[PDB]
Amino acid sequence: MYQLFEELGKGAFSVVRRCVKVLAGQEYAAKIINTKKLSARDHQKLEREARICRLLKHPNIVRLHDSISEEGHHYLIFDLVTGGELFEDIVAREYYSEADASHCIQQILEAVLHCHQMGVVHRDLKPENLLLASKLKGAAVKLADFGLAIEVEGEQQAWFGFAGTPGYLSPEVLRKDPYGKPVDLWACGVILYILLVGYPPFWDEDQHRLYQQIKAGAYDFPSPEWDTVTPEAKDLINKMLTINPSKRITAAEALKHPWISHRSTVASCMHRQETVDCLKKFNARRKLKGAILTTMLATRNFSGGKSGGNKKSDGVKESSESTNTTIEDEDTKVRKQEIIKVTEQLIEAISNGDFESYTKMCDPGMTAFEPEALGNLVEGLDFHRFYFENLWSSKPVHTTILNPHIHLMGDESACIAYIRITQYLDAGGIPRTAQSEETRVWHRRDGKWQIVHFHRSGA
Amino acid sequence: MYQLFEELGKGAFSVVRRCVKVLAGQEYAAKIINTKKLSARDHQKLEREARICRLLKHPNIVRLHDSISEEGHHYLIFDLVTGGELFEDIVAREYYSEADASHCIQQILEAVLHCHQMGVVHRDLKPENLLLASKLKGAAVKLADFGLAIEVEGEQQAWFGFAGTPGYLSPEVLRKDPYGKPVDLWACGVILYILLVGYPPFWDEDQHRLYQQIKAGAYDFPSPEWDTVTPEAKDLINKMLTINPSKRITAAEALKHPWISHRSTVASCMHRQETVDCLKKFNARRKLKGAILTTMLATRNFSGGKSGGNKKSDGVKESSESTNTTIEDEDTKVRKQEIIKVTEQLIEAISNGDFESYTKMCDPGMTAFEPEALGNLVEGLDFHRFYFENLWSSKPVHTTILNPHIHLMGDESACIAYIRITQYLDAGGIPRTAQSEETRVWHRRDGKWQIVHFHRSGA
């Protein structure tokens, strides 16, 4: 049904690859899940993932087109979005302000609101799920991958399992409390915070300490970098990073927050280069950590240095004549003889009065000096046509070529000079003979020898 | 004093590199020891290493030419041997027999005998120390690197420290007994054994168990591979792998052993392909185990098969030629004008009677049709010399070129045709005028346009 092309990204248990629907000629992203490596339970919950993704129809959410299981693999086929990660894109931009982060978060919150309205909680919102629709300027931000998403019943909370990514986990999930929609608003607070200053609100080498920080809500807004962030951006983060999920801002309420809905008078327009710089390192640390590592050694200076031997300039070593003959592309043979071949075919074409073959062997802009031109230079084949039509269209005539000389001037040019002697009969012969000295200038154009100019004397 | 070129090999605390003595023009191997990474004691014992290596003058031992210390490095400059390891070379050979292993061990024992006679014990004999003199057929085996070598006093034994390589360590060193020359004969027994069947006599993943095996002398000669080894090769190994160093064969006595001294009637001539095959794996396991510079790691193969193949970029046609612009002159040229330049210089050279410049612009084998040749084809410049010498060496004359046409036939060939009109005076002028139709065939040879043939009419 489909044809797989390049890989676009990975997880521990899936890869994503561009593919083409054979009979459609439409391109898609194939999420390819190795089902041999899943638990029975996670294999079974692919049914829930497939279902959630069909439900969700929103401009800021990538949708499922198809789901296929084979013996060792499951295939979830989605729309192709080609812009890559939002976070990678932010660091390649010429300008990045609070007003620009607000537009990112608004799109994310719109998507999340739509999930919540459909009874879907994502549970694992993180930078990797935030993709751009295309490489075009101002492409939309799109949610991708709902492999840990759950279905909820109205506003009812439950214990759906301990699932998520450490830095984005909500306090209620860490306390083992029944939970629901607010887990996604906590994760949006963490994402918003990273979008503003380029580093996460909660971080610790020790995962147990990290979780105590999260559960305590122990994040801060340190100077210098937070000093130029508006009070309203900080207010929205605070409302999202509220420890008690019953008191946490909802996606609907977040979208009405002035830093989002009154962006044009509230969100700062100042470029935040330090955010861009920190985010680069954040982005890089995210691509080293993972289940499988492509680099052989993890601890390598990322910056590099120049080695010795990088450029080499040698001296003028004394050399001899080195003509660069091209590699031959046909059966090996005598080029001189080749010229003799096309020349004999020329003489035979003139003798037979065959203007058709004479035209092929001559360039359309052929130059000519001949006694029939009375000292003038003739261009084209119109002039010799009069002799092909009248005279040569026919008593016995014998031609004889004497002392031929050939000059080869590269692969595509040659020149032959010879003496032509013609034996013929005039009226009631009386056999006669005539001499002429002829020069032909041949030139191979598109794999065919053609006369570009010729010269005749005494005829 | 020296110039360093390519790296030839390594240890943990040294690299070896080819170098050239600047003022000599002689090439050597530089052992470059990073003294910052040595213990005070091992730095100090470089004095002993330097001394031992100067003492040793033997055809099967690489000798020291120089020793230099800088602030962070010591340099021990030796003869360059270019054949690489004996062991690598054995596996690339077309034939390898007991008789060939006997010649290897004889060379090694000769070197070791010479050490022992000079009061030097190597202590760390292993495959890495066994180098070939050159890549020539039958190059000698040479001992290289004495960094763990010691000086002994006659036949006196002492405790010189626990030093060596695990698989080649003698029982007495492992028992912490005073020791001397026999430690090197134990290591030769281990090397000989590996030379015969391609695997070591003592091996264990657990180093403590390995040492108990060594101390017990618990090696064996298992079938099938030992079944075709002569009893005399086994006898020599047994004599060397004798646990009590007072009873172990000496280097002098080993050299008189029939498998060495009567090789031609004693050592088997049968090719041992299984030895060659095992030795390949032995050689490979030796090159993963330990290095200091970063080393790439291979991936185990996956079960069944993945599909795949070579990829070619696709497009509108097989090849491409930029955007679809209107088919017109994209950019202009001046080659036609170049031909006009050399042609005007030709006419001026003829007019001035300058045969010198006329010779340069003409090919030595120039072809010519002209009325002065009376219908004949003239080759060379001898014919026109008569006109340069006599006539043109001089009343007022004005030339006029009419209707010039140029055919470009590649980068290296061109042809120009034109009408030449000459105004002159005859005897007592009476101004006269003459017409001729001229064709020149130019060819660039070694960056210079030369006439290969020319044609003239009515002059």
mmCIF file of C-alpha atoms in Angstrom, chain B residues 7-309:
data_model
loop_
_atom_site.group_PDB
_atom_site.id
_atom_site.type_symbol
_atom_site.label_atom_id
_atom_site.label_comp_id
_atom_site.label_asym_id
_atom_site.label_seq_id
_atom_site.Cartn_x
_atom_site.Cartn_y
_atom_site.Cartn_z
ATOM 1 C CA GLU B 7 52.238 7.474 13.114
ATOM 2 C CA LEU B 8 53.274 3.840 12.935
ATOM 3 C CA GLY B 9 51.944 2.471 16.257
ATOM 4 C CA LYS B 10 51.023 3.156 19.875
ATOM 5 C CA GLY B 11 51.161 2.311 23.562
ATOM 6 C CA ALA B 12 49.277 3.849 26.531
ATOM 7 C CA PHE B 13 52.194 6.218 27.289
ATOM 8 C CA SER B 14 53.918 6.494 23.875
ATOM 9 C CA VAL B 15 53.296 6.751 20.130
ATOM 10 C CA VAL B 16 55.796 5.838 17.424
ATOM 11 C CA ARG B 17 56.099 7.960 14.301
ATOM 12 C CA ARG B 18 58.258 7.957 11.228
ATOM 13 C CA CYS B 19 60.656 10.879 11.217
ATOM 14 C CA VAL B 20 63.482 12.388 9.157
ATOM 15 C CA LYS B 21 66.704 13.821 10.569
ATOM 16 C CA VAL B 22 66.696 17.328 9.001
ATOM 17 C CA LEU B 23 70.483 17.725 8.411
ATOM 18 C CA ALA B 24 71.035 14.018 7.538
ATOM 19 C CA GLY B 25 68.154 13.132 5.214
ATOM 20 C CA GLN B 26 67.869 9.763 6.955
ATOM 21 C CA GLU B 27 64.641 8.306 8.219
ATOM 22 C CA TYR B 28 64.031 6.784 11.668
ATOM 23 C CA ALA B 29 61.239 5.769 14.086
ATOM 24 C CA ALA B 30 60.651 8.270 16.921
ATOM 25 C CA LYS B 31 59.298 6.786 20.141
ATOM 26 C CA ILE B 32 57.558 9.795 21.692
ATOM 27 C CA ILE B 33 56.915 9.338 25.408
ATOM 28 C CA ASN B 34 54.568 11.756 27.162
ATOM 29 C CA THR B 35 56.534 12.197 30.388
ATOM 30 C CA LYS B 36 53.685 14.137 32.074
ATOM 31 C CA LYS B 37 51.729 10.828 32.240
ATOM 32 C CA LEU B 38 54.489 8.691 33.727
ATOM 33 C CA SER B 39 55.198 8.057 37.395
ATOM 34 C CA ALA B 40 58.410 9.726 38.690
ATOM 35 C CA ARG B 41 59.888 6.227 38.741
ATOM 36 C CA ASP B 42 59.000 5.321 35.152
ATOM 37 C CA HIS B 43 60.224 8.688 33.967
ATOM 38 C CA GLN B 44 63.565 8.023 35.740
ATOM 39 C CA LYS B 45 63.829 4.499 34.334
ATOM 40 C CA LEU B 46 63.872 5.982 30.780
ATOM 41 C CA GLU B 47 67.592 6.470 31.506
ATOM 42 C CA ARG B 48 67.817 2.667 31.862
ATOM 43 C CA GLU B 49 65.768 2.034 28.706
ATOM 44 C CA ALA B 50 68.024 4.483 26.713
ATOM 45 C CA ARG B 51 71.133 2.736 28.048
ATOM 46 C CA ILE B 52 69.976 -0.818 27.361
ATOM 47 C CA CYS B 53 69.034 0.117 23.777
ATOM 48 C CA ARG B 54 72.412 1.665 22.988
ATOM 49 C CA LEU B 55 74.183 -1.481 24.299
ATOM 50 C CA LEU B 56 72.284 -3.794 21.976
ATOM 51 C CA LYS B 57 73.855 -4.267 18.520
ATOM 52 C CA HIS B 58 72.372 -7.255 16.710
ATOM 53 C CA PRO B 59 70.813 -7.907 13.271
ATOM 54 C CA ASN B 60 67.498 -9.036 14.837
ATOM 55 C CA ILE B 61 67.265 -6.074 17.280
ATOM 56 C CA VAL B 62 66.241 -2.515 16.303
ATOM 57 C CA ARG B 63 68.883 -0.099 17.610
ATOM 58 C CA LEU B 64 68.757 3.347 19.208
ATOM 59 C CA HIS B 65 70.375 6.251 17.402
ATOM 60 C CA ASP B 66 69.428 9.100 19.780
ATOM 61 C CA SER B 67 67.648 10.181 23.028
ATOM 62 C CA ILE B 68 66.257 13.675 23.672
ATOM 63 C CA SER B 69 64.209 15.160 26.585
ATOM 64 C CA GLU B 70 62.057 18.302 26.325
ATOM 65 C CA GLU B 71 59.719 19.772 29.005
ATOM 66 C CA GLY B 72 56.805 17.308 28.554
ATOM 67 C CA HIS B 73 58.248 14.611 26.279
ATOM 68 C CA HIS B 74 61.121 12.233 25.811
ATOM 69 C CA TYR B 75 62.223 11.090 22.343
ATOM 70 C CA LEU B 76 63.962 7.766 21.715
ATOM 71 C CA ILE B 77 65.004 7.625 18.076
ATOM 72 C CA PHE B 78 65.531 4.085 16.617
ATOM 73 C CA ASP B 79 66.138 2.466 13.237
ATOM 74 C CA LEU B 80 63.017 2.405 11.075
ATOM 75 C CA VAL B 81 61.748 -1.048 10.257
ATOM 76 C CA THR B 82 58.903 -0.953 7.722
ATOM 77 C CA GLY B 83 57.446 -4.516 7.506
ATOM 78 C CA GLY B 84 55.047 -4.180 10.478
ATOM 79 C CA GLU B 85 54.200 -7.012 12.840
ATOM 80 C CA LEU B 86 55.348 -10.546 12.104
ATOM 81 C CA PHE B 87 51.904 -11.770 13.272
ATOM 82 C CA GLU B 88 49.966 -9.570 10.810
ATOM 83 C CA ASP B 89 52.322 -10.675 8.067
ATOM 84 C CA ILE B 90 51.880 -14.420 8.791
ATOM 85 C CA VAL B 91 48.124 -14.214 8.082
ATOM 86 C CA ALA B 92 48.632 -12.457 4.692
ATOM 87 C CA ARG B 93 51.065 -15.213 3.491
ATOM 88 C CA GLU B 94 50.245 -17.866 0.876
ATOM 89 C CA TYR B 95 51.924 -20.647 2.850
ATOM 90 C CA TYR B 96 52.770 -21.099 6.506
ATOM 91 C CA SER B 97 54.323 -24.270 8.017
ATOM 92 C CA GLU B 98 56.179 -25.447 11.142
ATOM 93 C CA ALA B 99 59.417 -24.902 9.138
ATOM 94 C CA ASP B 100 58.381 -21.229 8.765
ATOM 95 C CA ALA B 101 57.521 -20.846 12.466
ATOM 96 C CA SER B 102 60.944 -22.338 13.291
ATOM 97 C CA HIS B 103 62.669 -19.652 11.281
ATOM 98 C CA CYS B 104 60.662 -17.001 13.227
ATOM 99 C CA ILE B 105 61.547 -18.453 16.615
ATOM 100 C CA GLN B 106 65.201 -18.928 15.674
ATOM 101 C CA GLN B 107 65.490 -15.190 14.879
ATOM 102 C CA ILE B 108 63.726 -14.299 18.162
ATOM 103 C CA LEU B 109 65.973 -16.634 20.166
ATOM 104 C CA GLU B 110 69.095 -15.212 18.499
ATOM 105 C CA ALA B 111 68.025 -11.697 19.593
ATOM 106 C CA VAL B 112 67.176 -12.921 23.116
ATOM 107 C CA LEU B 113 70.538 -14.746 23.412
ATOM 108 C CA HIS B 114 72.265 -11.500 22.527
ATOM 109 C CA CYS B 115 70.286 -9.616 25.227
ATOM 110 C CA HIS B 116 71.128 -12.261 27.832
ATOM 111 C CA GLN B 117 74.828 -12.156 26.888
ATOM 112 C CA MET B 118 74.739 -8.342 27.370
ATOM 113 C CA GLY B 119 73.041 -8.696 30.765
ATOM 114 C CA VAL B 120 69.640 -7.431 29.493
ATOM 115 C CA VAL B 121 66.318 -9.233 30.265
ATOM 116 C CA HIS B 122 63.375 -7.994 28.155
ATOM 117 C CA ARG B 123 60.615 -9.009 30.596
ATOM 118 C CA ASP B 124 57.719 -8.160 28.310
ATOM 119 C CA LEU B 125 58.160 -10.260 25.180
ATOM 120 C CA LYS B 126 54.865 -10.401 23.222
ATOM 121 C CA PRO B 127 53.629 -10.372 19.586
ATOM 122 C CA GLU B 128 53.745 -6.533 19.430
ATOM 123 C CA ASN B 129 57.538 -6.507 19.878
ATOM 124 C CA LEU B 130 58.021 -8.721 16.782
ATOM 125 C CA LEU B 131 58.427 -6.530 13.738
ATOM 126 C CA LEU B 132 59.611 -7.215 10.162
ATOM 127 C CA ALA B 133 62.623 -5.254 8.799
ATOM 128 C CA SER B 134 60.893 -4.385 5.524
ATOM 129 C CA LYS B 135 58.111 -5.419 3.154
ATOM 130 C CA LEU B 136 60.617 -7.337 0.990
ATOM 131 C CA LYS B 137 60.225 -11.106 0.737
ATOM 132 C CA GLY B 138 61.995 -12.909 3.580
ATOM 133 C CA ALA B 139 62.671 -9.732 5.620
ATOM 134 C CA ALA B 140 64.192 -10.428 9.048
ATOM 135 C CA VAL B 141 62.215 -10.473 12.251
ATOM 136 C CA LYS B 142 63.348 -7.759 14.613
ATOM 137 C CA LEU B 143 62.815 -7.085 18.330
ATOM 138 C CA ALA B 144 61.438 -3.582 18.970
ATOM 139 C CA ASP B 145 60.698 -1.761 22.280
ATOM 140 C CA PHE B 146 62.533 -2.507 25.538
ATOM 141 C CA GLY B 147 60.572 -0.170 27.810
ATOM 142 C CA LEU B 148 60.198 -2.831 30.491
ATOM 143 C CA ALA B 149 63.734 -4.291 30.010
ATOM 144 C CA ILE B 150 66.093 -4.618 33.016
ATOM 145 C CA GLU B 151 69.866 -4.973 33.537
ATOM 146 C CA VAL B 152 71.015 -8.032 35.534
ATOM 147 C CA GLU B 153 74.405 -8.875 37.088
ATOM 148 C CA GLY B 154 75.717 -12.116 35.638
ATOM 149 C CA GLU B 155 73.444 -15.007 36.587
ATOM 150 C CA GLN B 156 72.164 -13.359 39.774
ATOM 151 C CA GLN B 157 68.364 -13.347 40.321
ATOM 152 C CA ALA B 158 66.484 -10.456 41.991
ATOM 153 C CA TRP B 159 63.057 -9.006 42.555
ATOM 154 C CA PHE B 160 62.917 -6.324 39.862
ATOM 155 C CA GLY B 161 59.206 -5.636 40.302
ATOM 156 C CA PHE B 162 55.927 -7.057 39.044
ATOM 157 C CA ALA B 163 55.985 -6.092 35.372
ATOM 158 C CA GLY B 164 54.866 -7.768 32.143
ATOM 159 C CA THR B 165 51.786 -8.620 30.085
ATOM 160 C CA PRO B 166 49.312 -11.098 31.725
ATOM 161 C CA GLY B 167 49.331 -13.942 29.135
ATOM 162 C CA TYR B 168 53.156 -14.001 28.867
ATOM 163 C CA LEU B 169 54.071 -13.634 32.614
ATOM 164 C CA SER B 170 56.266 -16.361 34.015
ATOM 165 C CA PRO B 171 55.303 -18.398 37.063
ATOM 166 C CA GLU B 172 58.233 -16.999 39.109
ATOM 167 C CA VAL B 173 57.147 -13.437 38.523
ATOM 168 C CA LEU B 174 53.621 -14.450 39.649
ATOM 169 C CA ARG B 175 54.980 -16.259 42.752
ATOM 170 C CA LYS B 176 56.963 -13.100 43.620
ATOM 171 C CA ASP B 177 60.227 -15.001 43.402
ATOM 172 C CA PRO B 178 63.536 -13.452 42.500
ATOM 173 C CA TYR B 179 64.002 -13.825 38.759
ATOM 174 C CA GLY B 180 66.191 -13.225 35.767
ATOM 175 C CA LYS B 181 66.867 -14.428 32.243
ATOM 176 C CA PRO B 182 64.511 -17.379 32.204
ATOM 177 C CA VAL B 183 61.414 -15.099 32.262
ATOM 178 C CA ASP B 184 62.116 -14.349 28.581
ATOM 179 C CA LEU B 185 62.218 -18.129 27.699
ATOM 180 C CA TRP B 186 58.826 -18.636 29.234
ATOM 181 C CA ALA B 187 57.433 -15.819 27.064
ATOM 182 C CA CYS B 188 59.149 -17.475 23.976
ATOM 183 C CA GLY B 189 57.332 -20.693 24.774
ATOM 184 C CA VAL B 190 54.016 -18.789 24.792
ATOM 185 C CA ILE B 191 54.903 -17.059 21.484
ATOM 186 C CA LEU B 192 56.022 -20.364 19.905
ATOM 187 C CA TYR B 193 52.816 -22.027 20.948
ATOM 188 C CA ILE B 194 50.740 -19.181 19.366
ATOM 189 C CA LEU B 195 52.889 -19.415 16.205
ATOM 190 C CA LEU B 196 51.954 -23.111 15.793
ATOM 191 C CA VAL B 197 48.198 -23.137 16.429
ATOM 192 C CA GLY B 198 47.120 -19.437 16.496
ATOM 193 C CA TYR B 199 45.851 -19.229 20.091
ATOM 194 C CA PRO B 200 47.592 -18.762 23.475
ATOM 195 C CA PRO B 201 48.351 -21.622 25.946
ATOM 196 C CA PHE B 202 46.880 -19.728 28.926
ATOM 197 C CA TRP B 203 43.697 -17.667 28.776
ATOM 198 C CA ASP B 204 40.925 -16.820 31.206
ATOM 199 C CA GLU B 205 38.404 -13.959 31.509
ATOM 200 C CA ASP B 206 39.296 -13.909 35.240
ATOM 201 C CA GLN B 207 42.866 -12.707 35.690
ATOM 202 C CA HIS B 208 43.307 -14.508 39.030
ATOM 203 C CA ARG B 209 42.393 -17.824 37.396
ATOM 204 C CA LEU B 210 44.736 -17.055 34.504
ATOM 205 C CA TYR B 211 47.604 -16.669 36.976
ATOM 206 C CA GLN B 212 46.805 -19.968 38.711
ATOM 207 C CA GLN B 213 46.886 -21.666 35.272
ATOM 208 C CA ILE B 214 50.276 -20.118 34.514
ATOM 209 C CA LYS B 215 51.719 -21.037 37.914
ATOM 210 C CA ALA B 216 50.424 -24.629 37.484
ATOM 211 C CA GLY B 217 51.769 -24.897 33.907
ATOM 212 C CA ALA B 218 48.291 -26.057 32.931
ATOM 213 C CA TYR B 219 48.399 -25.808 29.109
ATOM 214 C CA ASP B 220 47.533 -28.658 26.732
ATOM 215 C CA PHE B 221 47.958 -29.867 23.114
ATOM 216 C CA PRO B 222 44.339 -30.657 22.070
ATOM 217 C CA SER B 223 43.253 -32.574 18.989
ATOM 218 C CA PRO B 224 42.567 -32.021 16.091
ATOM 219 C CA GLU B 225 45.049 -29.194 15.540
ATOM 220 C CA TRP B 226 48.002 -30.507 17.566
ATOM 221 C CA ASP B 227 47.758 -33.995 15.975
ATOM 222 C CA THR B 228 49.713 -32.885 12.931
ATOM 223 C CA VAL B 229 52.347 -30.928 14.922
ATOM 224 C CA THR B 230 55.683 -32.824 15.218
ATOM 225 C CA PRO B 231 56.689 -34.280 18.615
ATOM 226 C CA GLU B 232 59.857 -32.138 18.417
ATOM 227 C CA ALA B 233 57.966 -28.822 18.241
ATOM 228 C CA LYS B 234 55.959 -30.017 21.328
ATOM 229 C CA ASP B 235 59.169 -31.027 23.091
ATOM 230 C CA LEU B 236 60.644 -27.520 22.599
ATOM 231 C CA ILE B 237 57.468 -25.826 23.911
ATOM 232 C CA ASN B 238 57.533 -28.188 26.926
ATOM 233 C CA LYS B 239 61.163 -27.317 27.654
ATOM 234 C CA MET B 240 60.349 -23.605 27.570
ATOM 235 C CA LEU B 241 57.080 -23.825 29.499
ATOM 236 C CA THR B 242 58.812 -25.495 32.453
ATOM 237 C CA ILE B 243 57.546 -24.068 35.788
ATOM 238 C CA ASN B 244 60.881 -24.197 37.561
ATOM 239 C CA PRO B 245 63.128 -21.589 35.987
ATOM 240 C CA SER B 246 66.288 -23.472 37.012
ATOM 241 C CA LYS B 247 65.088 -26.370 34.826
ATOM 242 C CA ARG B 248 63.849 -24.214 31.891
ATOM 243 C CA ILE B 249 65.765 -24.399 28.566
ATOM 244 C CA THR B 250 68.125 -21.412 27.973
ATOM 245 C CA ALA B 251 68.255 -19.376 24.687
ATOM 246 C CA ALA B 252 71.580 -20.991 23.763
ATOM 247 C CA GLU B 253 70.174 -24.487 24.401
ATOM 248 C CA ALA B 254 66.907 -23.705 22.560
ATOM 249 C CA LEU B 255 68.866 -22.700 19.476
ATOM 250 C CA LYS B 256 70.546 -26.160 19.444
ATOM 251 C CA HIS B 257 67.173 -27.941 19.694
ATOM 252 C CA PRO B 258 66.646 -30.120 16.616
ATOM 253 C CA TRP B 259 63.357 -28.422 15.634
ATOM 254 C CA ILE B 260 65.494 -25.291 15.157
ATOM 255 C CA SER B 261 69.029 -26.532 14.280
ATOM 256 C CA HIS B 262 67.835 -29.578 12.281
ATOM 257 C CA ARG B 263 64.792 -27.791 10.844
ATOM 258 C CA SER B 264 65.198 -29.364 7.366
ATOM 259 C CA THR B 265 64.677 -32.956 8.576
ATOM 260 C CA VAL B 266 62.596 -32.236 11.715
ATOM 261 C CA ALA B 267 60.043 -29.381 11.205
ATOM 262 C CA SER B 268 56.904 -30.175 9.194
ATOM 263 C CA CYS B 269 56.442 -28.558 5.763
ATOM 264 C CA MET B 270 52.681 -28.843 5.754
ATOM 265 C CA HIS B 271 50.635 -25.639 5.394
ATOM 266 C CA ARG B 272 48.591 -24.938 8.540
ATOM 267 C CA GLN B 273 45.522 -23.004 7.282
ATOM 268 C CA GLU B 274 43.753 -23.391 10.658
ATOM 269 C CA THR B 275 46.648 -21.576 12.390
ATOM 270 C CA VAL B 276 46.368 -18.754 9.843
ATOM 271 C CA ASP B 277 42.596 -18.543 10.448
ATOM 272 C CA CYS B 278 42.842 -18.565 14.282
ATOM 273 C CA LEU B 279 45.725 -16.084 14.198
ATOM 274 C CA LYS B 280 43.505 -13.576 12.287
ATOM 275 C CA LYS B 281 41.036 -13.563 15.172
ATOM 276 C CA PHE B 282 43.876 -13.426 17.716
ATOM 277 C CA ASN B 283 45.306 -10.459 15.859
ATOM 278 C CA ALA B 284 41.911 -8.750 15.803
ATOM 279 C CA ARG B 285 41.153 -9.320 19.526
ATOM 280 C CA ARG B 286 44.599 -7.756 20.282
ATOM 281 C CA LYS B 287 43.682 -4.496 18.463
ATOM 282 C CA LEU B 288 40.336 -3.847 20.265
ATOM 283 C CA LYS B 289 41.573 -4.478 23.884
ATOM 284 C CA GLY B 290 43.604 -1.331 24.648
ATOM 285 C CA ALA B 291 44.397 2.016 23.017
ATOM 286 C CA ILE B 292 44.473 5.676 24.121
ATOM 287 C CA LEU B 293 43.153 7.501 20.971
ATOM 288 C CA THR B 294 39.362 7.006 20.365
ATOM 289 C CA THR B 295 38.577 3.641 18.401
ATOM 290 C CA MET B 296 35.269 2.921 16.343
ATOM 291 C CA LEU B 297 33.021 -0.116 17.535
ATOM 292 C CA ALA B 298 31.176 -2.529 15.147
ATOM 293 C CA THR B 299 27.328 -3.360 15.570
ATOM 294 C CA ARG B 300 26.177 -7.059 15.802
ATOM 295 C CA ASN B 301 24.158 -8.096 12.617
ATOM 296 C CA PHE B 302 20.275 -8.112 12.842
ATOM 297 C CA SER B 303 18.245 -11.440 12.154
ATOM 298 C CA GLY B 304 16.654 -12.103 8.674
ATOM 299 C CA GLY B 305 17.142 -9.155 6.342
ATOM 300 C CA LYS B 306 16.215 -5.503 5.775
ATOM 301 C CA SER B 307 15.582 -4.324 2.200
ATOM 302 C CA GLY B 308 17.611 -1.504 0.654
ATOM 303 C CA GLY B 309 19.956 -0.162 -2.136
#
